[PDB]
Every structure is written in C-alpha cells, then in structure tokens.
Amino acid sequence: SHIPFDFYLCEMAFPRVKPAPDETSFSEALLKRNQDLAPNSAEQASILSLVTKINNVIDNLIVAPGTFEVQIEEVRQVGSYKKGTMTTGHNVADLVVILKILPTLEAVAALGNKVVESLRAQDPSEVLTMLTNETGFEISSSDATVKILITTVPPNLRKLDPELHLDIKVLQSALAAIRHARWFEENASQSTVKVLIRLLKDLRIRFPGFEPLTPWILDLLGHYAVMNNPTRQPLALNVAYRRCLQILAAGLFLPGSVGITDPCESGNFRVHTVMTLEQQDMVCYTAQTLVRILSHGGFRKILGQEGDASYLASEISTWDGVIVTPSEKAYEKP
C-alpha cells in the first residue's frame, strides 16, 4: 500500500535551483540507439507479408471451416508485432488463436499442418517450415517467423484435463497476451512509449541484473515512465528513460511497494511480484548503480554505444574523478 518516491510525480515540490543540464546529446543518442535497434524495412516487409498470409488463412477457417475439425473462435495479433516494439534481428510476430474446441496436441498439429498447407497451395514457390511447439505452432519463411499461440474459450479452461490438453499455463498466457495487446493499443499507442520499451528491452539484455523483468513488466514500466505524470503530456524520451532508472532505484518493485498494478488482471495484482525477493533486490540495485552512472554522464555506455558495459553494474568505475561503487546485494535468504 506504500507508493515509493517518484520525482516526476511531485516535481512542483522540488523546484530546480538551476536549469537541468543540456541533454541534447543524450536525446540524440537515445534516438540513434532506437534507430539501430528498430527492424529494417526488409524485416518489416517480410513479417508483414507472413503475418498477413497466415492471418488471412485463419480468418477464412473461422468463417468457412467446412470439414476441418479444429474449429476456431477468434484470431488476434498480439505481442511486439502488434504493439510496435519489435527489435531488429528477431523478426517474429505472435498470433493468438482461440479454439472453440479442447486444445489437444493432436488438434494443434492438425491446425498447424492445415494452415501451412493452405499457404503452400496458394504459393508453392515460397518455402515455409511449420513446427509444433509448447504453445501451439510456428510458421517460418527464410526471413520471418509467426508464432501461433493456441488457447481456448473459457468453458474449456475450467474443463481442462492435464492429460491430452496443452498446459493451462500456456492457454492462460495466450489469453493474457490478447488482454495486453488491447490494453497497449488503447493506453500505450504513443511514439515515445514504444521507443522507450524497445530501449528497455535492450537495456535488459545488456545488464542481466534486469533479467527478471518480463516483457509485460517492461511494457507497463515504459508506459508508466512516459505517461503517468502531471504535465499531462508524454515525458520526453531522455526524461522518461532516466525516470525508469530512478523509480526502480527508489524501489518501485521492492517489498512494501504498490509497484504497478496489472491493468489486465483482477483485482489489484502487483506485477513485480512475479519476481522473487532476491530478484527484486537485484533489479533495484542494478537500477541504483545505473542511476548514478547516468548522473556522471555515462549515457553512451548505458545505451550500448561503447561496447560491453555490463561490468559497470558489478565493478567500481570512475567518472571525471568521481568513484562509483556499484550497489550490492542486500537481500538475505531466511
């Protein structure tokens, strides 16, 4: 029930004595990094192409299944492709397919085969591969992959049997992905939010202290940082990026904190509680170190523009004479 300190929630209470330093270079670096990370045109075209073809086939199966046994209630585009937060080099889109029937491994394989064969019938020259997996199946071209996350209608969930049916965890996560995509389209369809999330994804890769943060937590964190603020305008990217580090450092995701309530669940689920206490400590202490590094002008290292920087979170570093000691673990096993 405790809401940790966030400077950007009460700026009027902390007036600046002197203007903030000029962050033109940081702002430029953030955009350059976003541009580096953003999918190129070829990637954008190949994923659009594959998603469209698959989504068309599935749409058709929905209206005109005919003899086909695996009946489909609905298909939705979800995830990074739908949110506009994809990263270059990972050209994968997700579709959620809600079956009317019980999702058996067998039905999933039949649907996967059915969809890819429809594509091959329409265009024999395009080489695709279709493999089933834990969550449904996936179809790949040489250039792009579309994952079909299978789930089912509500009746069937409380009606599930672990015996022959895809795991409940998988069916629920696919349903959550639809909720997330809907929430995102309505609440986080702002340029700066999508860019910040792409940058956070990258930050997490380069500083594995952030590994416990999940994609949904990053979505919510990016949205919070840009949008949740009394200027009633999206915060500028350089400001929101710093804010992400500050609020983590100030313990947004620590024990005692309300953190961020999941807007796609009932009733008031604190999203960060998917992390263990130890992981909460680590995410916090990693942000705490980076907060300080950023203050000493380490933005290029933080942004990944000066090679590996991961050691900044674990080793002492020096910045124009100032010695920075990384924040260290506080959590203790019971």
């Binding site: 004595v17 002197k18 313990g251 005692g256 203050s295 010695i323 000691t325 924040s327 959590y331």
Partner: protein, 324 residues
C-alpha cells in the same frame, strides 16, 4: 504498514531522545537567559526614556531536535538597528547582572564580536553552551539593496557587527519559523529528523546533510506523500527520495524556501559527497525493504513527541501549525 520498521525507528528514537535531566537543564538555562535578556532590554529602555526588539529560539531548541549529548543551544537577539560592538558589550555586561534577578546559577559570559554573538556557559559537566546571536532585519535589507544595485545611505557607527554573521542569524531565524510552520506538525517528520540526525553523526557519509539540509529533505520527501505516514514508512520515503538521485549533480537539489535568491540547500556538497550519500541511501532503502532497517539505524534487531521543552513564557510567540 511496516509495523516492524515503526517499532525500530521508535526504539531508535527513544535511544537518542534527551534524558529528562538534560531537558530540565536546557529549560532552566534557556528560561534564565530569556528572562535575563528581557531584563537587559527593560533596563536599556529605561536608560533611554526598542533597542532590543526581542529574543527568538532558533536551531535545535526551537525545532525540538535536541538529542542525547547536545551541549549547544541557540537564541537570536533582534535589534532595532544593525547591532554594534558597543551594543554587544553593553548587553553582555548587563546580562551578568540581570541573571542574578532570576538565578544564582553561575554562568560564564563570553562575547565574540567576530561571531556577532554572546556565548553563555553553565557550570554543569559537561557544560551547556548557549549562543546569543545579535542581528537585525536591517542587515538583510542592506544586503538586498546592494545586490539590487541600490546605494546605501546609512550613517553607520564605526562598529556595526559582521553583516555575514548577522545574515546567517536571520537565516536561522527564518528556518526556525519555517520549521514550526511546516515540519513540526507533519506526522513523523520530527521523529525521522531526530533519527536521521543521529545517522548523520554515526555515518560520516551523511555528515554533510546534518542540520538545515536534512530538515528540508525530510519535510519535502515526507510531505510529498499523499497521506500521513508512521515513522517506519516516513523514514523509508526519505531513503527513496535520496535513492532516486535527488542530490546528484544533475538532480533538482533541495530548493531553500527561506532564501529569496534561488538557493540549493545542498549546493555545498561536492560530486563525490553526492555520490556517496546517494549510494548509501540506496543501500539503506534495500536494507529496509528486506527487513534489515535495524542495520541502517545502528541497532540490534528487536526481540505528540515533538515538544521537548515548553515554549517561552518570556517571549511568547503565535503558534503556527501545519494544516490538518
């Protein structure tokens, strides 16, 4: 929320709160001094028939921030005109006489023209030491006019007291009034300042915050919460504020509400000091979150607090109170 943390903060608070013996000794000496000074004032006035415009408590005595071990008390003596060496000597001399109208306790009276002050020491061991700062609202006006490019027209005694010292004294007076108006009635604020004051003593990294910057930091950070907080949560919020980087060189700093020219109450910290304090609060925050606040407080794990001495009956002031 944070029941265990409340317990530890309050236990720590008890450990640092002055004994009744210390508080009685402070009350005694402050009251004697205030009464003696009023007598000095009356005597000057009669010898004229104004010169001394009143005596104000500042610092730890005013704010209720005395802790076990504090020997230093402070008052501000307000003069109608800029105070002079002549007035300082006059006051110091007559004080020795007027004191005998209220007590037989022996007091050493030392004037310090350079400090624009009179220091009084009792004979207890260790002795309490009360500094009487002489100043006038006129010293600020003159300084302000100069900064505003105005020319001073003042037939000045050749011995006006150091304007810098006298300006600092008005500043401490501003702080005391601000403290009573804003910090005192802010739930948990005084308690947290007392505890963090002790922390600043125990942990040299925090030393540079001791006093006004810490008071401001605590009131601001605690006051920005959307609801009253118990001591455990309130302390945590101060830690979160610091952990967020608020005192780092590119942070907003802590705007001094008692200065007309925009002033950072922590602007005196160098880069390494800011770095160290930030890192320390960051670690303390996580210690608190993970059940180890006792380590921050320098204590072993456990198995209206604001008024320390009565307000002056000699120089009674109108009590301002932070709005409900």
């Amino acid at each position: 929320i944070f029941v265990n943390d409340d317990r530890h903060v309050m236990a720590k608070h008890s450990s640092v709160y002055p004994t009744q013996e210390e508080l009685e000794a402070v009350q005694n000496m402050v009251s004697h001094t205030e009464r003696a000074l009023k007598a000095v004032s009356d005597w000057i006035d009669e010898q004229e028939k104004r010169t001394l415009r009143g005596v104000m408590r500042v610092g730890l005595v005013a704010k209720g921030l005395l802790l076990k071990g504090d020997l230093d008390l402070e008052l501000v003596l307000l003069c109608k005109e800029k105070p002079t060496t002549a007035l300082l000597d006059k006051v110091a001399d007559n004080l020795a006489i007027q004191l005998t109208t209220v007590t037989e306790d022996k007091y050493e009276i030392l004037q310090s023209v350079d400090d624009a002050a009179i220091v009084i020491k009792n004979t207890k061991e260790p002795p309490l030491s009360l500094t009487i700062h002489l100043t006038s609202p006129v010293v600020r006006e003159e300084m302000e006019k100069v900064l505003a490019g105005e020319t001073l027209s003042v037939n000045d005694p050749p011995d006006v007291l150091d304007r810098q010292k006298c300006l600092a004294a008005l500043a401490s007076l501003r702080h005391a009034k601000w403290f009573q108006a804003r910090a005192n009635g802010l739930k948990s604020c005084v308690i947290v300042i007392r505890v963090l004051r002790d922390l600043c003593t125990r942990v040299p990294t925090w030393g540079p915050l001791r006093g006004w910057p810490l008071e401001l930091l605590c009131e601001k950070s605690i006051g920005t919460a959307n609801r009253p907080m118990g001591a455990g949560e309130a302390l945590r919020r101060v830690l979160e504020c610091l952990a967020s980087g608020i005192v780092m060189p590119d942070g907003s700093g802590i705007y001094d509400p008692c200065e007309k020219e925009a002033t950072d109450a922590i602007g005196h910290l160098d880069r390494q000091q800011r770095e160290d304090i930030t890192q320390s609060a960051q670690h303390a925050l996580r210690l608190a979150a993970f059940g180890q606040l006792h380590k921050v407080l320098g204590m072993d794990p456990l198995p209206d607090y604001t008024v320390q001495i009565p307000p002056s009956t000699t120089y009674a002031i109108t009590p301002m109170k932070r709005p409900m």
